[PDB]
């Protein structure tokens, strides 16, 4: 069907257990050759006598759409209402889903993915700690601005650049529902690439990996009231919920912890946990030993 | 063996070792070390419920001149792990004859009081164990290695499904620039 | 110009459907396709040319 | 008359010349598990006659001051012939039962017993912040005894009849399948219970599907009635027993 | 190839990559007792899967000078799960069997075993004017051993292989259902035996319906073949087991 | 694709109905079934095989 539509029937039922009786033949379903690279299609009924079971179990929650389509925090940063640093008056990062692991490991199960994204922002502010704490600051209004690669970059909370005549921006005031919007599949290519065993330069050097393929611009966020007698500080959290998904060439789930955002680097890590012996099976069922 | 290719090799050998059990492990696909980091296991860990039959394929990697029969048994819960071949053969099992077909499939049929089991398994949702025994030792001609390895593969059958999405215990971080 | 389709069935073995209307000009704005359930394990579990009947030897 | 009645299961038959009726579950007769209700995939064993027949448990004595008695159920029949053997060898089991409580006296005796099958009779501890014992719960055949006063002791069930070991009003146990044995009119009680649980099958050692309680509400009494010995006997017959998940036998 | 073969009974499956054929009784597949052949009138129990499955007996070692081995049959499976329990609880029983003898070696080993099922294998005593023991006849699983010379002793079977404990020419045991295991070509033997007796049913403790004998005719041999250990394993599966005359269990 | 059914009758012996449309994809999201009124006391008050006519003795 069309993977852009918000409706589409059909139950995802698993297989019924076919009733099976005794057998004496040359059929040898339980004997295969794993060398071929084929995974055996044996079901219980091929190796034991089974009853018939009408199975209603469905695989609805393990569909790629339902697995990825849940908002995940992919970034968080702070900025102050007032400070001497100018820089600390606004936040900015470079769009990517590589800075928070949960989301990253989920995506990295697939080599390529294509999708629209529902972005939701959760912004909070707190009054900074100090000796004098009394003030009456009106509601804070924030501005989130997206700068596609190549656009002029803000240099202060009051730069002309925040005019957003063309960059898309969101103005939001505290106390209301978190801001939200959909972004289409924005790639230069036919699918976003999660891994790239390649370089940026033709001479097989330059930058290696995911980074050379990125370049989706950055986000800048600042307060608009711009002031507060006493210092305050806000935290902006951004969430991604992919929707209308397509994925290709699955790969094993990341086993070693991530070391940084630009690389696939890792330290050698254990295949799994140890146990006492290759025959160790704990004894449950005892008058409690 | 946690960081060496051995963790994947089940040792088996020529000579009299019948009393000696070849291996055994609990059937907790999303929880026990034997399974949790498996393709099936990693997937189960993103969910809280599972149900279905499981396929265990065993492949013999000795020389072609090697010979032998093994007993692969699965015991549903309720008793402790069989401690002898006598006890093990009273449950679900295949007798595997090593031959040109290098591999044998032990399918673990879904037998449970409930339609689903917790991936984070408890005694209430116990699934039993599978153990393996020499059915008739490994015989070999002269000039060939007297010991070899058997490998074991796992995969879900077509009656398998999972429910109730949750985060994996397996990945974490102490700070951003992740 | 709306669409009516069925709901995922809950707590029991006509009022089991919902209606939806799209209010935006871009497909990106639409909700997720949580109801599409296709499947093709074959790409991965059995990518062998020469069909393996498996009830037969597999070698020989 | 309709007081007369006979019942046959396997190689066993029961008779009464003074029955009331026969109570049937919540109106449901036992049935074997249907394909559209099953999960365990292996072929079941259905021993039939070897298993679905009348087993008689050890009798109890009704004394002028007996508070009552109880039995937990799948456990209690665990040593009864092949029904018990099939229990030991399988992980899962399922059965219904015909319960026949017998108690005869004379036209000059009087007393009244409530005979109830309580599904899922989770019991409370004597020691309020402690927990019970399997022993405080059941002793297989034999039978635990209710008590006329509050009990103490760690592990034992708080058994003052008045609260039926469950924290309710004993006189409300009638929403459960039951019959009364009023000596002046009746000499037995028969209840057919269907399998009741929130899963299609279950383990028979780990879960007491239901409890049988015999509680005298009007006490035994008589005169120079050279019959002071008035026993009560419980006979039960599994119905439609089926088992799944065969393996080695469970550890006693 | 037709060397490949699989068999499934109950929750158990056997496989071979080097079979000969499969021998069937005297051409007769096991069947359940028909109404026009029955005398015992009570309803039978037919446990089916719980009972008709593969039980593996304790293995034996084939040595360069092993004379042979034997097992008596309904007895021998008397402690095998529910098949044995049903034996203890019933007066009458009836069953057929799939017998699967396993023995693998190597293309550099040699030897040849005769595998036979002898119906009604009444055995003779060592002490010519004495009588046998049940012990001299069978030891359940395990297995009695034939001998290379004449034996003595009261109660033991005159077991010189040469006369098969029956007073005949061992080399004539072929009129009985059998297969050979010739190591150079074959690694197992499969015989399906139907119930054979002069009455429709019988007691399973008192009567050994048939004896399984494994007699090497050409002895085991090999060279620096770092494999001197060549075991033989017997797996058997009751077929169509049915039981009659239920009562308390028999005294061990 | 909506449903119209009647309201529970109030303060008096056509405008006595309401309309509803389901906006969610899961049945769990729907409102309660406050209008279903079946009943079967029998399971509990009369679970005796052998029908008791009661206008007749009940014993005898
Ligand atoms: C671009 C904003 C469009 C607003 C669309 C609202 C639709 C209101 C439901 C109207 C009744 C359904 C008509 C049919 O189709
Ligand atoms: C998933 C959100 C769906 C929003 C559904 C709103 C339905 C609006 C009423 C439209 C007029 C009724 C059409 C008929 O049926
Ligand atoms: N104001 C929001 C700007 C959003 C642009 C988001 C582009 C997200 C692309 C998702 C990329 C994930 C990947 O590399 O797989």
PDB file of N, CA and C in Angstrom, chain A residues 67-127:
ATOM      1  N   UNK A  67       7.000   0.519  16.284  1.00  0.00           N
ATOM      2  CA  UNK A  67       8.201   0.368  17.074  1.00  0.00           C
ATOM      3  C   UNK A  67       8.959   1.688  17.199  1.00  0.00           C
ATOM      4  N   UNK A  68       8.954   2.480  16.121  1.00  0.00           N
ATOM      5  CA  UNK A  68       9.673   3.753  16.105  1.00  0.00           C
ATOM      6  C   UNK A  68       8.820   4.965  16.451  1.00  0.00           C
ATOM      7  N   UNK A  69       7.529   4.868  16.159  1.00  0.00           N
ATOM      8  CA  UNK A  69       6.620   5.984  16.353  1.00  0.00           C
ATOM      9  C   UNK A  69       6.197   6.340  17.775  1.00  0.00           C
ATOM     10  N   UNK A  70       7.165   6.753  18.581  1.00  0.00           N
ATOM     11  CA  UNK A  70       6.918   7.195  19.948  1.00  0.00           C
ATOM     12  C   UNK A  70       7.984   8.248  20.139  1.00  0.00           C
ATOM     13  N   UNK A  71       7.549   9.424  20.585  1.00  0.00           N
ATOM     14  CA  UNK A  71       8.429  10.552  20.808  1.00  0.00           C
ATOM     15  C   UNK A  71       9.524  10.120  21.761  1.00  0.00           C
ATOM     16  N   UNK A  72      10.765  10.521  21.435  1.00  0.00           N
ATOM     17  CA  UNK A  72      11.987  10.230  22.194  1.00  0.00           C
ATOM     18  C   UNK A  72      12.837  11.496  22.337  1.00  0.00           C
ATOM     19  N   UNK A  73      13.427  11.721  23.514  1.00  0.00           N
ATOM     20  CA  UNK A  73      14.246  12.916  23.705  1.00  0.00           C
ATOM     21  C   UNK A  73      15.518  12.745  22.894  1.00  0.00           C
ATOM     22  N   UNK A  74      15.828  13.689  22.028  1.00  0.00           N
ATOM     23  CA  UNK A  74      17.028  13.499  21.236  1.00  0.00           C
ATOM     24  C   UNK A  74      18.019  14.574  21.529  1.00  0.00           C
ATOM     25  N   UNK A  75      17.630  15.460  22.439  1.00  0.00           N
ATOM     26  CA  UNK A  75      18.499  16.558  22.805  1.00  0.00           C
ATOM     27  C   UNK A  75      17.947  17.455  23.927  1.00  0.00           C
ATOM     28  N   UNK A  76      18.841  18.061  24.724  1.00  0.00           N
ATOM     29  CA  UNK A  76      18.436  19.006  25.770  1.00  0.00           C
ATOM     30  C   UNK A  76      19.566  19.988  26.027  1.00  0.00           C
ATOM     31  N   UNK A  77      19.217  21.259  26.222  1.00  0.00           N
ATOM     32  CA  UNK A  77      20.206  22.296  26.467  1.00  0.00           C
ATOM     33  C   UNK A  77      19.636  23.451  27.284  1.00  0.00           C
ATOM     34  N   UNK A  78      20.514  24.310  27.800  1.00  0.00           N
ATOM     35  CA  UNK A  78      20.065  25.433  28.622  1.00  0.00           C
ATOM     36  C   UNK A  78      20.458  26.773  28.082  1.00  0.00           C
ATOM     37  N   UNK A  79      19.767  27.807  28.531  1.00  0.00           N
ATOM     38  CA  UNK A  79      20.082  29.156  28.110  1.00  0.00           C
ATOM     39  C   UNK A  79      19.523  30.029  29.210  1.00  0.00           C
ATOM     40  N   UNK A  80      20.175  31.166  29.444  1.00  0.00           N
ATOM     41  CA  UNK A  80      19.772  32.083  30.495  1.00  0.00           C
ATOM     42  C   UNK A  80      19.084  33.305  30.028  1.00  0.00           C
ATOM     43  N   UNK A  81      18.307  33.829  30.947  1.00  0.00           N
ATOM     44  CA  UNK A  81      17.525  35.000  30.701  1.00  0.00           C
ATOM     45  C   UNK A  81      18.486  36.158  30.748  1.00  0.00           C
ATOM     46  N   UNK A  82      19.418  36.068  31.669  1.00  0.00           N
ATOM     47  CA  UNK A  82      20.348  37.155  31.824  1.00  0.00           C
ATOM     48  C   UNK A  82      21.699  36.672  32.249  1.00  0.00           C
ATOM     49  N   UNK A  83      22.720  37.217  31.612  1.00  0.00           N
ATOM     50  CA  UNK A  83      24.081  36.830  31.928  1.00  0.00           C
ATOM     51  C   UNK A  83      25.066  37.754  31.233  1.00  0.00           C
ATOM     52  N   UNK A  84      26.314  37.664  31.658  1.00  0.00           N
ATOM     53  CA  UNK A  84      27.365  38.495  31.105  1.00  0.00           C
ATOM     54  C   UNK A  84      27.971  37.852  29.874  1.00  0.00           C
ATOM     55  N   UNK A  85      27.762  36.550  29.716  1.00  0.00           N
ATOM     56  CA  UNK A  85      28.337  35.811  28.603  1.00  0.00           C
ATOM     57  C   UNK A  85      27.722  35.954  27.212  1.00  0.00           C
ATOM     58  N   UNK A  86      26.584  36.618  27.054  1.00  0.00           N
ATOM     59  CA  UNK A  86      25.954  36.751  25.719  1.00  0.00           C
ATOM     60  C   UNK A  86      25.645  35.390  25.088  1.00  0.00           C
ATOM     61  N   UNK A  87      26.649  34.528  25.056  1.00  0.00           N
ATOM     62  CA  UNK A  87      26.549  33.175  24.522  1.00  0.00           C
ATOM     63  C   UNK A  87      25.572  32.340  25.297  1.00  0.00           C
ATOM     64  N   UNK A  88      25.585  32.537  26.608  1.00  0.00           N
ATOM     65  CA  UNK A  88      24.726  31.773  27.463  1.00  0.00           C
ATOM     66  C   UNK A  88      23.273  32.272  27.411  1.00  0.00           C
ATOM     67  N   UNK A  89      23.014  33.236  26.537  1.00  0.00           N
ATOM     68  CA  UNK A  89      21.675  33.787  26.399  1.00  0.00           C
ATOM     69  C   UNK A  89      20.805  33.070  25.389  1.00  0.00           C
ATOM     70  N   UNK A  90      21.382  32.091  24.710  1.00  0.00           N
ATOM     71  CA  UNK A  90      20.612  31.313  23.762  1.00  0.00           C
ATOM     72  C   UNK A  90      21.293  29.976  23.568  1.00  0.00           C
ATOM     73  N   UNK A  91      20.502  29.001  23.159  1.00  0.00           N
ATOM     74  CA  UNK A  91      20.971  27.652  22.948  1.00  0.00           C
ATOM     75  C   UNK A  91      21.026  27.340  21.455  1.00  0.00           C
ATOM     76  N   UNK A  92      21.879  26.391  21.076  1.00  0.00           N
ATOM     77  CA  UNK A  92      21.998  26.002  19.672  1.00  0.00           C
ATOM     78  C   UNK A  92      22.684  24.653  19.501  1.00  0.00           C
ATOM     79  N   UNK A  93      22.188  23.820  18.599  1.00  0.00           N
ATOM     80  CA  UNK A  93      22.840  22.556  18.341  1.00  0.00           C
ATOM     81  C   UNK A  93      22.684  22.250  16.870  1.00  0.00           C
ATOM     82  N   UNK A  94      23.209  21.104  16.484  1.00  0.00           N
ATOM     83  CA  UNK A  94      23.174  20.657  15.105  1.00  0.00           C
ATOM     84  C   UNK A  94      22.305  19.416  15.090  1.00  0.00           C
ATOM     85  N   UNK A  95      21.248  19.475  14.306  1.00  0.00           N
ATOM     86  CA  UNK A  95      20.304  18.389  14.259  1.00  0.00           C
ATOM     87  C   UNK A  95      20.890  17.025  13.931  1.00  0.00           C
ATOM     88  N   UNK A  96      20.559  16.056  14.776  1.00  0.00           N
ATOM     89  CA  UNK A  96      20.997  14.673  14.610  1.00  0.00           C
ATOM     90  C   UNK A  96      20.308  13.863  15.698  1.00  0.00           C
ATOM     91  N   UNK A  97      20.249  12.550  15.542  1.00  0.00           N
ATOM     92  CA  UNK A  97      19.625  11.720  16.572  1.00  0.00           C
ATOM     93  C   UNK A  97      20.718  10.904  17.231  1.00  0.00           C
ATOM     94  N   UNK A  98      21.926  11.430  17.181  1.00  0.00           N
ATOM     95  CA  UNK A  98      23.038  10.703  17.723  1.00  0.00           C
ATOM     96  C   UNK A  98      23.497  11.102  19.087  1.00  0.00           C
ATOM     97  N   UNK A  99      22.775  11.971  19.780  1.00  0.00           N
ATOM     98  CA  UNK A  99      23.293  12.355  21.079  1.00  0.00           C
ATOM     99  C   UNK A  99      22.587  11.698  22.273  1.00  0.00           C
ATOM    100  N   UNK A 100      21.489  10.985  22.053  1.00  0.00           N
ATOM    101  CA  UNK A 100      20.803  10.312  23.163  1.00  0.00           C
ATOM    102  C   UNK A 100      20.700   8.880  22.648  1.00  0.00           C
ATOM    103  N   UNK A 101      21.172   7.949  23.462  1.00  0.00           N
ATOM    104  CA  UNK A 101      21.251   6.569  23.051  1.00  0.00           C
ATOM    105  C   UNK A 101      20.003   5.766  22.777  1.00  0.00           C
ATOM    106  N   UNK A 102      19.016   5.862  23.653  1.00  0.00           N
ATOM    107  CA  UNK A 102      17.847   5.062  23.441  1.00  0.00           C
ATOM    108  C   UNK A 102      17.366   5.130  21.986  1.00  0.00           C
ATOM    109  N   UNK A 103      17.083   6.347  21.509  1.00  0.00           N
ATOM    110  CA  UNK A 103      16.602   6.613  20.144  1.00  0.00           C
ATOM    111  C   UNK A 103      17.605   6.151  19.127  1.00  0.00           C
ATOM    112  N   UNK A 104      18.857   6.471  19.397  1.00  0.00           N
ATOM    113  CA  UNK A 104      19.896   6.100  18.474  1.00  0.00           C
ATOM    114  C   UNK A 104      19.952   4.565  18.284  1.00  0.00           C
ATOM    115  N   UNK A 105      19.994   3.780  19.366  1.00  0.00           N
ATOM    116  CA  UNK A 105      20.068   2.333  19.183  1.00  0.00           C
ATOM    117  C   UNK A 105      18.850   1.821  18.417  1.00  0.00           C
ATOM    118  N   UNK A 106      17.667   2.420  18.638  1.00  0.00           N
ATOM    119  CA  UNK A 106      16.451   1.983  17.939  1.00  0.00           C
ATOM    120  C   UNK A 106      16.662   2.201  16.434  1.00  0.00           C
ATOM    121  N   UNK A 107      17.008   3.412  16.026  1.00  0.00           N
ATOM    122  CA  UNK A 107      17.216   3.658  14.600  1.00  0.00           C
ATOM    123  C   UNK A 107      18.304   2.778  13.980  1.00  0.00           C
ATOM    124  N   UNK A 108      19.417   2.631  14.702  1.00  0.00           N
ATOM    125  CA  UNK A 108      20.553   1.877  14.198  1.00  0.00           C
ATOM    126  C   UNK A 108      20.333   0.406  14.000  1.00  0.00           C
ATOM    127  N   UNK A 109      19.104  -0.035  14.179  1.00  0.00           N
ATOM    128  CA  UNK A 109      18.816  -1.435  13.947  1.00  0.00           C
ATOM    129  C   UNK A 109      18.639  -1.611  12.452  1.00  0.00           C
ATOM    130  N   UNK A 110      18.423  -0.493  11.766  1.00  0.00           N
ATOM    131  CA  UNK A 110      18.248  -0.498  10.320  1.00  0.00           C
ATOM    132  C   UNK A 110      19.380   0.290   9.666  1.00  0.00           C
ATOM    133  N   UNK A 111      19.832  -0.137   8.488  1.00  0.00           N
ATOM    134  CA  UNK A 111      20.893   0.600   7.808  1.00  0.00           C
ATOM    135  C   UNK A 111      20.343   1.888   7.198  1.00  0.00           C
ATOM    136  N   UNK A 112      19.179   1.814   6.559  1.00  0.00           N
ATOM    137  CA  UNK A 112      18.565   3.012   5.984  1.00  0.00           C
ATOM    138  C   UNK A 112      17.125   3.184   6.450  1.00  0.00           C
ATOM    139  N   UNK A 113      16.720   4.424   6.637  1.00  0.00           N
ATOM    140  CA  UNK A 113      15.356   4.680   7.043  1.00  0.00           C
ATOM    141  C   UNK A 113      14.847   5.916   6.331  1.00  0.00           C
ATOM    142  N   UNK A 114      13.544   5.939   6.100  1.00  0.00           N
ATOM    143  CA  UNK A 114      12.903   7.059   5.439  1.00  0.00           C
ATOM    144  C   UNK A 114      11.631   7.376   6.214  1.00  0.00           C
ATOM    145  N   UNK A 115      11.446   8.655   6.538  1.00  0.00           N
ATOM    146  CA  UNK A 115      10.262   9.064   7.271  1.00  0.00           C
ATOM    147  C   UNK A 115      10.074  10.539   7.517  1.00  0.00           C
ATOM    148  N   UNK A 116       8.827  10.838   7.848  1.00  0.00           N
ATOM    149  CA  UNK A 116       8.481  12.183   8.252  1.00  0.00           C
ATOM    150  C   UNK A 116       8.736  12.154   9.772  1.00  0.00           C
ATOM    151  N   UNK A 117       8.845  13.335  10.385  1.00  0.00           N
ATOM    152  CA  UNK A 117       9.113  13.416  11.816  1.00  0.00           C
ATOM    153  C   UNK A 117       8.229  14.412  12.505  1.00  0.00           C
ATOM    154  N   UNK A 118       7.643  13.988  13.621  1.00  0.00           N
ATOM    155  CA  UNK A 118       6.846  14.870  14.452  1.00  0.00           C
ATOM    156  C   UNK A 118       7.770  15.339  15.575  1.00  0.00           C
ATOM    157  N   UNK A 119       8.112  16.620  15.544  1.00  0.00           N
ATOM    158  CA  UNK A 119       8.958  17.221  16.573  1.00  0.00           C
ATOM    159  C   UNK A 119       8.117  17.923  17.646  1.00  0.00           C
ATOM    160  N   UNK A 120       8.393  17.621  18.914  1.00  0.00           N
ATOM    161  CA  UNK A 120       7.660  18.209  20.042  1.00  0.00           C
ATOM    162  C   UNK A 120       8.748  18.736  20.963  1.00  0.00           C
ATOM    163  N   UNK A 121       8.564  19.947  21.473  1.00  0.00           N
ATOM    164  CA  UNK A 121       9.531  20.582  22.361  1.00  0.00           C
ATOM    165  C   UNK A 121       8.966  20.748  23.755  1.00  0.00           C
ATOM    166  N   UNK A 122       9.747  20.408  24.780  1.00  0.00           N
ATOM    167  CA  UNK A 122       9.305  20.644  26.154  1.00  0.00           C
ATOM    168  C   UNK A 122      10.286  21.642  26.745  1.00  0.00           C
ATOM    169  N   UNK A 123       9.780  22.826  27.058  1.00  0.00           N
ATOM    170  CA  UNK A 123      10.588  23.914  27.596  1.00  0.00           C
ATOM    171  C   UNK A 123      10.179  24.231  29.010  1.00  0.00           C
ATOM    172  N   UNK A 124      11.171  24.364  29.890  1.00  0.00           N
ATOM    173  CA  UNK A 124      10.909  24.684  31.299  1.00  0.00           C
ATOM    174  C   UNK A 124      11.889  25.732  31.788  1.00  0.00           C
ATOM    175  N   UNK A 125      11.493  26.514  32.773  1.00  0.00           N
ATOM    176  CA  UNK A 125      12.400  27.527  33.294  1.00  0.00           C
ATOM    177  C   UNK A 125      12.382  27.448  34.804  1.00  0.00           C
ATOM    178  N   UNK A 126      13.471  27.859  35.418  1.00  0.00           N
ATOM    179  CA  UNK A 126      13.524  27.809  36.861  1.00  0.00           C
ATOM    180  C   UNK A 126      14.152  29.126  37.231  1.00  0.00           C
ATOM    181  N   UNK A 127      13.935  29.579  38.458  1.00  0.00           N
ATOM    182  CA  UNK A 127      14.569  30.821  38.885  1.00  0.00           C
ATOM    183  C   UNK A 127      15.872  30.378  39.509  1.00  0.00           C
TER     184      UNK A 127
END
